[PDB]
Design a protein around this nucleic acid. Structure first.
Ligand SMILES: [Zn+2]
Ligand SMILES: [Zn+2]
Lengths: 76, 191, 91, 135, 118, 95
RNA sequence: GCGUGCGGUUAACAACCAACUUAGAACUGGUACGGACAGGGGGAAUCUGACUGUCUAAUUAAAACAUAGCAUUGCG
RNA sequence: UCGUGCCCCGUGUGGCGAAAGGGAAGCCGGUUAAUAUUCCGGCACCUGGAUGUGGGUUUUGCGCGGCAACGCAACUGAACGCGGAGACGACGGCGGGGGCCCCGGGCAGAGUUCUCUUUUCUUCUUAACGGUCUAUCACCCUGGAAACAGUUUGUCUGGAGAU
């Protein structure tokens, strides 16, 4: 797993061909949001403070990339 | 133990001039009371250099240049034919015949004294550590000086464990049971 | 503060092995455990590593020496007569 | 007298250019604020010209006679000065103290040093300076 | 809480290839983890000191890391230390200068001998 | 006699004791004499001789060790090489 | 919040934090106080083997054997 | 191409022999009546191969910076050589780190409660793999130390350059 700190590099990673899926994890107790994109070798996580612009980053994300919200319970 | 303690084979460089080596390590040889010296010489016929193992004479040190050959100087650690040294010189690892890489005067604190020369028949009279007199060919080699580690036997062993540690790596029979303590079928002294 | 009258370093052996044998071994232990002055660098750091092997902790020189002393008197006298013979041969 | 003067040939003993031969462009014996010790501004050879044999073509000779230079502020303790001297008029004030404060000035100075050193090497003189040290 | 642990492999003996350390899992359990032997620092070929700037790994781990991490940008870098390299440079220069001096002296003596003979 | 001359230079003249200060003196070119101990390493001895040849400085090979050279200088520490910068009232330079 | 040029060693002072040993004193119960547990009896000598160690698995553990030390013989 | 040859090199000889020696690489959670570092889920690693993209280098052809120790994502390297690792005793005290043990507060749950006890007990966890910032030894630069200094529980270090 790798942290991405640059929004430009995160956008290029999300536009990579081997980016199969992506998910959004909301941590309201720490007031933060995590964008996790699954690629071939690594899972890339971008950590942001929760905000309106942090929500509109999903609009700048590619449309063909499937993006899902992480639920409160990880049902098997 | 890694290698036997021998001179270089008697080659053209030692027969006609001298060849230089460098002493890299002075190491402990298990089962031997004397230290060994690892000396690196050049090969006169190829680019790779050759590592030898000598019995170290006293006063030899790491980084020292030593010289082996007919025209080598008379300095401790140098290897010379017996015809190249004067009378009264003591030497170590003296060859019985030219080329067997050392036979006489090898243990710690021991040496062989050049008593005299017979240049007509090319012979050298030498005195051995036991006191014996021997005649060898004058082309036999020897290393100038006395074998290091002298005075080893002066210290008492003081303990059966120290005797056991000495002889375990030497393979000699220890402990020794007296023949008179045996039965008549075990020893002629038995009974 | 001196702790023993005469045994010295042989006091580790207690009452064992005999007084004469302990006194005989004491000389060798004292000389083999003493520190010596290096003839190469001048520091008092030469110590025995194995029998006949003496190394300097400072300049890392290893020297073939006596079993329990750095030099033996036979080898020192031998160096003197070797120098004499070399001078005679050269001159 | 003093020997660490201009046109003095030295050997660099420390750093990336250890074992390379340099010529002193400028001695700074009293030091500066940036380097408060005796030091020198020197120019030297990073990559030596290759050996040239009698059967090589002209193109191969021209390829193998190329010299890669470098310039350096160097402490006096990291130099081994030699009895050789190398006097080149084209290297007069080729570098100074604020040359090393700007990357383009370093490139222009290295171009000048390369040109002058290649002229001297093609002259056939000072062969000890252009042969590498073996160690 | 259960505090005692077991080996996770079929070797039951405390050999040099059976080193373990204790971890606590996200499941709240005390467990062992089998670990490798510590890597050894590379050492200078002349003096034997540990070389600064070089990682200490098991021997096959050096094949996975890039070249500038395995060496120092200097002649004999990653093989000899800086003091030994400086000694090599100074000794080489001085010995070749002495060879030139000896050759000059030998030529002068040979010329003097030839003049005396002629 | 060289010990008496050395004591006179310590009393009256100016010296620097040690390898790095000796090299700095030779680089400055104001060194009048160099003394090298007998047991100085041969590489350092050759380096000091080359520096002194390039600066035209006389070299005296002191027959004692660095311990003896320090004692001759009057110090309680060893000294493998030293530089005389000012002779003082001694005639050590006239030899 | 950093650079100098000074100046002073009563910080011998304040604020906060922390642990286990050791010594001394009063009072008090008593048939017992290392209250169970755990845990040398000691001394005068003689013979004997120097000591540590070893053996007769399944009747003998020893003045037996070994030992360091000493002495002799043979071998270049 | 006299086309059916010539040159270079030297080191010897193979195999078996360790589920405690040496050795490429996997962790956590869950799951069965019975297997699990092997199954499932998530997240990784090693070895070998092919061949792209981006980035790098180069018109001063094979990088730049630092006095130096050396650094940085790269940053050519055959023959033939040198070196390091693999790779190493026993014992003693001292210092660092993990885990365990111990203590205080807080939320939640449980037990005790004639009286007392803001009480006694239980959960309060964080893997491999990575990133980043740090951690004794040692090494480098300045400088030149007797009124010797630095310093460990243990007296070693310093003009061969200490503090
Ligand atoms: Zn030394
Ligand atoms: Zn080194």
């Amino acid at each position: 797993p790798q942290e991405v700190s640059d929004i430009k590099k995160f956008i290029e990673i999300c536009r990579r061909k081997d980016a199969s899926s992506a998910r959004i994890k909301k941590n309201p107790k720490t007031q933060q949001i995590k964008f996790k994109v699954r690629c071939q070798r690594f899972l890339y996580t971008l950590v942001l403070k929760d905000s309106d612009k942090a929500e509109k980053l999903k609009q700048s994300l590619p449309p063909n990339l499937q993006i899902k919200d992480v639920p409160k319970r990880n049902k098997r | 133990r890694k290698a036997p303690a021998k001179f270089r084979p008697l080659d053209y460089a030692e027969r006609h001039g001298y060849i230089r080596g460098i002493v890299k390590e002075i190491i402990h040889d298990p089962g031997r009371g004397a230290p060994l010296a690892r000396v690196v010489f050049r090969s006169p016929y190829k680019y790779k250099q050759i590592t030898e193992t000598f019995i170290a004479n006293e006063g030899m040190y790491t980084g020292q240049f030593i010289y082996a050959g007919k025209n080598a100087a008379l300095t401790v650690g140098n290897i010379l034919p017996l015809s190249s040294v004067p009378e009264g010189t003591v030497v170590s690892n003296v060859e019985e015949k030219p080329g067997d890489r050392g036979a006489l005067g090898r243990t710690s604190g021991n040496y062989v004294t050049v008593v005299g020369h017979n240049p007509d028949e090319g012979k050298t009279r030498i005195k051995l550590p036991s006191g014996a007199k021997k005649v060898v060919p004058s082309s036999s080699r020897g290393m100038i000086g006395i074998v290091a580690g002298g005075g080893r036997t002066d210290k008492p062993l003081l303990k059966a464990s120290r005797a056991k540690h000495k002889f375990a790596v030497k393979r000699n029979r220890w402990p020794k049971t007296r023949g008179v303590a045996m039965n008549p079928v075990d020893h002629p002294h038995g009974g | 503060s001196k702790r023993t009258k005469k045994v010295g370093i042989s006091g580790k052996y207690g009452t064992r092995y005999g007084a004469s044998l302990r006194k005989l071994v004491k000389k060798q232990e004292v000389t083999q455990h003493a520190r010596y002055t290096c003839t190469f660098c001048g520091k008092n750091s030469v110590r025995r590593t194995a029998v006949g092997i003496w190394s300097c902790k400072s300049c890392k020189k290893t020297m073939a020496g006596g079993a329990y002393t750095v030099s033996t008197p036979a080898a020192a006298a031998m160096r003197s007569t070797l120098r004499r013979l070399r001078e005679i041969t050269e001159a | 007298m003093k020997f660490l003067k201009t046109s003095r040939v030295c050997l660099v003993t420390r750093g990336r250019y250890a074992g390379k031969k340099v010529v002193i462009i400028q001695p700074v014996d009293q030091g500066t604020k940036s380097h408060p010790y005796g030091h020198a501004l020197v120019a030297g050879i990073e990559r030596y010209p290759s050996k040239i044999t009698r059967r090589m073509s002209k193109a191969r000779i021209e390829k193998r006679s190329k010299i890669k230079p470098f310039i350096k502020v160097i402490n006096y303790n990291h130099l081994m000065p030699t009895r050789y001297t190398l006097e080149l008029e084209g290297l007069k004030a080729v570098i100074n103290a604020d040359t090393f404060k700007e990357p383009s000035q370093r490139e222009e100075a290295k171009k000048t040093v390369k040109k002058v050193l290649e002229d001297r090497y093609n002259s056939g003189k000072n062969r000890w300076f252009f042969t590498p040290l073996r160690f | 809480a259960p505090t005692r642990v077991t080996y996770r492999r079929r070797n039951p003996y405390n050999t040099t290839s059976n080193r373990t350390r204790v971890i606590k899992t996200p499941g709240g359990q005390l467990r062992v983890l089998h670990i490798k032997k510590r890597g050894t620092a590379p050492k200078c070929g002349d003096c034997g000191i540990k070389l600064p700037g070089i990682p200490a790994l098991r021997p096959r781990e050096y094949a996975t890391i890039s070249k500038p991490k395995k060496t120092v940008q200097r002649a004999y870098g990653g093989s000899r230390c800086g003091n030994c390299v400086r000694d090599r440079i100074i000794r080489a220069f001085l010995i070749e200068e002495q060879k030139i001096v000896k050759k000059v002296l030998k030529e002068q003596s040979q010329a003097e001998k030839k003049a005396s003979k002629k | 006699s060289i010990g008496a001359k050395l004591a006179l230079v310590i009393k009256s003249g100016k010296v620097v004791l040690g390898y790095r200060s000796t090299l700095k003196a030779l680089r400055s070119g104001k060194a009048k004499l160099i003394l090298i101990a007998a047991n100085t390493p041969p590489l350092r001895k050759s380096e000091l001789e080359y520096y002194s040849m390039m600066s035209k400085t006389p070299v005296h090979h002191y027959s004692g060790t660095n311990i003896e050279l320090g004692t001759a200088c009057g110090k309680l520490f060893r000294c493998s090489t030293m530089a005389i910068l000012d002779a003082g009232d001694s005639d050590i330079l006239a030899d």
